[PDB]
Write an enzyme that holds these catalytic residues in place. Structure first.
Site, PDB file in Angstrom:
ATOM      1  CD  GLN A 119       1.829  -6.373  -1.584  1.00 21.86           C
ATOM      2  OE1 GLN A 119       2.647  -6.105  -0.700  1.00 21.86           O
ATOM      3  NE2 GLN A 119       0.949  -5.484  -2.041  1.00 21.86           N
TER       4      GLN A 119
ATOM      5  NE  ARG B 127      10.061  -3.017   4.048  1.00 20.42           N
ATOM      6  CZ  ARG B 127       8.753  -2.939   4.279  1.00 20.42           C
ATOM      7  NH1 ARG B 127       8.010  -2.033   3.656  1.00 20.42           N
ATOM      8  NH2 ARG B 127       8.183  -3.790   5.118  1.00 20.42           N
TER       9      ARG B 127
ATOM     10  CG  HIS C 143       5.608  -7.956   3.483  1.00 24.73           C
ATOM     11  ND1 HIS C 143       4.285  -7.714   3.183  1.00 24.73           N
ATOM     12  CD2 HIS C 143       6.227  -6.752   3.446  1.00 24.73           C
ATOM     13  CE1 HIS C 143       4.113  -6.420   2.969  1.00 24.73           C
ATOM     14  NE2 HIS C 143       5.278  -5.815   3.124  1.00 24.73           N
TER      15      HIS C 143
ATOM     16  CG  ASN D   2       5.182  -4.969   6.181  1.00 28.61           C
ATOM     17  OD1 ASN D   2       5.624  -3.825   6.043  1.00 28.61           O
ATOM     18  ND2 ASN D   2       3.980  -5.328   5.745  1.00 28.61           N
ATOM     19  CD  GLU D   3       1.646  -2.048   6.792  1.00 26.95           C
ATOM     20  OE1 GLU D   3       0.482  -2.506   6.794  1.00 26.95           O
ATOM     21  OE2 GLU D   3       2.010  -1.117   6.039  1.00 26.95           O
TER      22      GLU D   3
ATOM     23  CG  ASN E   3       5.279   0.246   6.364  1.00 34.71           C
ATOM     24  OD1 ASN E   3       6.469   0.564   6.320  1.00 34.71           O
ATOM     25  ND2 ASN E   3       4.872  -1.019   6.261  1.00 34.71           N
TER      26      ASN E   3
ATOM     27  CE1 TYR F  92       1.329   2.334   3.360  1.00 36.34           C
ATOM     28  CE2 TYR F  92       1.154   3.235   1.131  1.00 36.34           C
ATOM     29  CZ  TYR F  92       1.619   2.258   2.007  1.00 36.34           C
ATOM     30  OH  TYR F  92       2.348   1.187   1.532  1.00 36.34           O
TER      31      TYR F  92
ATOM     32  CD  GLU G 219       4.786  -0.873   3.116  1.00 36.55           C
ATOM     33  OE1 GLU G 219       3.608  -0.464   3.195  1.00 36.55           O
ATOM     34  OE2 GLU G 219       5.102  -2.073   3.267  1.00 36.55           O
TER      35      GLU G 219
ATOM     36  CD1 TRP H  28       2.677   0.361  -1.509  1.00 39.68           C
ATOM     37  CD2 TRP H  28       4.425  -0.833  -0.772  1.00 39.68           C
ATOM     38  NE1 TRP H  28       2.384  -0.972  -1.692  1.00 39.68           N
ATOM     39  CE2 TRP H  28       3.439  -1.725  -1.248  1.00 39.68           C
ATOM     40  CE3 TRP H  28       5.620  -1.358  -0.256  1.00 39.68           C
ATOM     41  CZ2 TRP H  28       3.610  -3.118  -1.223  1.00 39.68           C
ATOM     42  CZ3 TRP H  28       5.790  -2.745  -0.231  1.00 39.68           C
ATOM     43  CH2 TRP H  28       4.789  -3.607  -0.712  1.00 39.68           C
TER      44      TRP H  28
ATOM     45  CD  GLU I 259      -1.147  -2.760  -3.450  1.00 43.32           C
ATOM     46  OE1 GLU I 259      -0.057  -2.362  -3.912  1.00 43.32           O
ATOM     47  OE2 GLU I 259      -1.366  -2.857  -2.223  1.00 43.32           O
ATOM     48  CD1 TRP I 260      -1.847  -5.998   0.656  1.00 47.15           C
ATOM     49  CD2 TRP I 260      -1.525  -8.213   0.746  1.00 47.15           C
ATOM     50  NE1 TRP I 260      -0.500  -6.215   0.853  1.00 47.15           N
ATOM     51  CE2 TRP I 260      -0.275  -7.566   0.911  1.00 47.15           C
ATOM     52  CE3 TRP I 260      -1.570  -9.614   0.767  1.00 47.15           C
ATOM     53  CZ2 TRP I 260       0.919  -8.274   1.095  1.00 47.15           C
ATOM     54  CZ3 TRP I 260      -0.378 -10.320   0.951  1.00 47.15           C
ATOM     55  CH2 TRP I 260       0.849  -9.644   1.113  1.00 47.15           C
TER      56      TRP I 260
ATOM     57  CE1 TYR J  88      -2.466   0.507  -2.988  1.00 46.18           C
ATOM     58  CE2 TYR J  88      -1.142   2.177  -1.882  1.00 46.18           C
ATOM     59  CZ  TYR J  88      -2.297   1.425  -1.961  1.00 46.18           C
ATOM     60  OH  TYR J  88      -3.257   1.563  -0.984  1.00 46.18           O
TER      61      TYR J  88
END
Lengths: 492, 490
Positions: free
Chosen positions: B28, B86, B132, B180-181, B321, B323, B396, B447, B454-455, B463
């Site tokens: 990212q 992080r 990640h 991560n996630e 994480n 949101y 996050e 985050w 952003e993917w 963000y």
């Protein structure tokens, strides 16, 4: 004092006693009565009954009901829960077979005598006695077509509504469908005595993982059709209909969150099985996810008739159990239908102590708190509908090798204490919002206790089988008598 | 919107040892996608070959150019008084061919050591995410990456990558996060296929509808857990120091029963399980949640005893994480319903609007984030009451301001991110409330220290608490949120 007083409960509250046809009636083949699945089972396999007995005579209530009613009257009971013998009414179990006049008249006389004496009848239509003629024609509730037994049961209920609907205001279509299905086709300890090969029952040529669900499904379809019939042609503003569920309280074995999940699955497999279908029209999610194809799906039309098919519900509460988690893994496979809950039901906790004090027989452990838990669940989870504790009590062991002296049987202080504690729990539950409206001590009379035969006396009234089945009030009955004397005393 | 000054969180609301930082990920923000021998990743490959699977058809060839501007990143963190930072390590930047025999890239080791040392120089504690989502494209073509049907190659290769990290950064890094996630990665990459490589079940809309959305996510997730277990074992037996810790971070959306029916409570239960429990329970007790096993059945792999042992308790801390949240609505098992996506195994619909028609919380701008700090509290209570109250870090938390070519976001408005500030303040305030309730939460990471790629949303969402002008040499600009955080920590 915390000893229950009648003024602890609303004026409209109901207090009674309960029995079932095969257990107390006798006259098994008198006046045209047809053979039932239990007559058949006991006569064919006396060795499957603890003391090798049968209920050919029972408490001989077919001929002694007037004494039964007199005692109920003396004790000041508000109601009396009893069942109707399907085969006594319809010897061949069908409309084709014809109705038995003497059967109709027996129940008509009982109902009228009760009402004349100011005792309200709570009638159980089916209390496990399936006419053998139906068992042989299509296996009774094992009817794979889901049509024959539904029609036959529906007509039976119709005959009851037709001949007694003008006097009866409280109906219970079925008694403990979970016990019936699981014990009759799972462990096979009840008639007809079927179970999976390898299991110890009279006919180990069944399937404990399937038949119990087949039977249960037919029972729910039959219940839905009978209630549909009732609401369309016999329902009255003041009459109520429902059914009674057997229920053992469930408590997490350990502290792990896994035992809490195990507990939930256990309430589901025991109570949820038949409760959720009449509440929302389908089986508990947990059951559908675990039993899968072994648990039949309901047509949308059936789901509709099922949802809300009651005005009240009965709960038969006796004891509780600790539920211990069993993980889904390649090293575990269910054997009994009740194994589908992935949890073992334990009497003893991780400390080696029983959930509550043993009451005498092999399975009853006193745990009133379990009843409170159950009532809070009905209140908070299932809409808080009208609830009647249609059964509660204990069995005093009395066998040939260990004879129970009559004086001791009459001084049933453990039963009295047990009854008082559960009635007290009902008060606590009411003060917490519970919509419970009545309590019935199980066994107005000592009777034939299914596979336990005459080894257990559950009555508040002693029956001397050695002497013309003469009745004798026990201490429990005497306490209930004073308890019911006045709704609101003066001075408790 | 933005209320009472007496409600504004103060640093003294938390213990002296509490940790406040910001977070980012390699793909990212780094850029330099093929510089100094860096290998191609699944994302380099996906964005290059499938620009139509990215909202604005962009890619992160440059990102925030942090591979070159990391010194400025550290500067900002220092100015804001952050206690930690992080960031993640690029597997392919370290091992171009994702394998041991492929060799280690000296320029990669160097880059991260320079970042780590500069961070420690300025008193900032590094929290390193090992994986990640950027799998070496070489491994993807070799055996499908985490789709490894042998459940051996990927475990070995990942364990080696982890070892290289421990060996070369362990002397300075005391906080490690293996993955991560995992739920987001598996579901998005092999379920809906919105993430690289973009696989899904035949008949579904994604780049490669030749997969199985009911099996591949689970196969991948199973391999991830085996990889995590192995890496943790390695860490404890050769790198673990009394003052160092390792764990992983889970993506989590709060779950609230849609209606009053007990059926929705059960739906909410299954939902927390499929989202959080899927990877949480295995590391806590060594197995998947009962609900998932009863529903996915054989589509959910069994663990060997040796693996259950390695998995149980394989963490010293856990990252969350968070949101937003959703209302969970029951769906009955029936002959008329069949799961399509692995997430459908939960038999529940996730709704934004409740029975009264109101959104679970105010929309924050993008298509999925709705402000519901109470959901974070519900999450911490679950961790406290159900999973042993382990040390927890909110790894996050934040929002993404929409900035598209159709509707460009004026830079001035981008800098005056009061909505983000409000959201950040409220969630930190919630941590104070949860702490007073017994929660063992130890830190919070906003985050996106920087606006980044952003993917599948590409650059349509910012963000960062720090603005990045990709037009002008990726220059950084402090936003109001960053300025408040600066004041907060001072």
């Amino acid at each position: 004092s915390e000893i229950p007083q009648r003024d602890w409960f609303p004026s409209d509250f109901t207090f009674g006693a309960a029995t079932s046809a095969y257990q107390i009636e006798g006259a098994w083949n008198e006046d045209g009565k047809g053979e039932s699945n239990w007559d058949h089972f006991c006569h064919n396999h006396p060795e499957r009954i603890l003391d090798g007995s049968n209920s050919d005579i029972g408490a001989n209530s077919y001929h002694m009901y007037k004494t039964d009613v007199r005692l109920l009257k003396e004790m000041g009971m508000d109601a009396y829960r009893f069942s109707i013998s399907w085969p006594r009414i319809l010897p061949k179990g069908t409309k084709e077979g014809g109705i038995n006049p003497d059967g109709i008249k027996y129940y008509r006389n009982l109902i009228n005598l009760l009402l004349e004496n100011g005792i309200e009848p709570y009638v159980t239509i089916f209390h496990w006695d399936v006419p053998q003629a139906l068992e042989e024609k299509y296996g009774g509730f094992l009817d794979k077509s889901h049509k024959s037994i539904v029609e036959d049961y529906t007509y039976f209920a119709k005959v009851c509504f037709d001949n007694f609907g003008d006097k009866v205001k409280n109906w219970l279509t079925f008694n403990e469908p979970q016990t019936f299905t699981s014990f009759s086709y799972g462990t096979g300890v009840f008639a007809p005595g079927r179970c999976s090969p390898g299991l110890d029952c009279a006919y180990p040529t069944g399937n404990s993982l399937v038949e119990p669900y087949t039977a249960g499904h037919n029972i729910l379809l039959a219940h839905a059709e009978a209630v549909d019939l009732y609401n369309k042609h016999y329902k009255r503003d003041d009459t109520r209909i429902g059914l009674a569920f057997d229920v053992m309280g469930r408590v997490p074995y350990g502290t792990s969150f896994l035992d809490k999940q195990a507990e939930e699955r256990s309430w589901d497999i025991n109570l949820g099985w038949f409760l959720e279908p009449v509440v929302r029209g389908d089986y508990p999610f947990s059951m559908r996810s675990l039993a899968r194809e072994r648990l039949p799906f309901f047509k949308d039309e059936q789901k509709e008739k099922l949802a809300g098919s009651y005005n009240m519900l009965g709960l038969n509460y006796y004891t509780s159990r600790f539920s211990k988690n069993i993980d889904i893994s390649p090293n575990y496979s269910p054997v009994l239908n009740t194994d589908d809950a992935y949890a073992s039901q334990e009497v003893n906790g991780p400390d080696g102590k029983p959930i509550g004090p043993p009451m005498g027989n092999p399975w009853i452990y006193m745990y009133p708190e379990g009843l409170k838990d159950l009532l809070m669940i009905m209140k908070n989870k299932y809409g808080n509908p009208p609830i009647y504790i249609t059964e509660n009590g204990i069995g005093d062991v009395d066998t040939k090798e260990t004879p129970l002296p009559m004086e001791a049987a009459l001084n049933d202080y453990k039963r009295l204490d047990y009854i008082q504690r559960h009635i007290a729990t009902l008060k606590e539950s009411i003060d917490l919002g519970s919509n419970v409206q009545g309590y019935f001590a199980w066994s107005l009379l000592d009777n034939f206790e299914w596979f336990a035969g005459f080894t257990e006396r559950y009555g508040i009234v002693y029956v001397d089988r050695n002497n013309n089945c003469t009745r004798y009030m026990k201490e429990s009955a005497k306490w209930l008598k004073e308890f019911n004397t006045a709704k609101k005393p003066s001075k408790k």
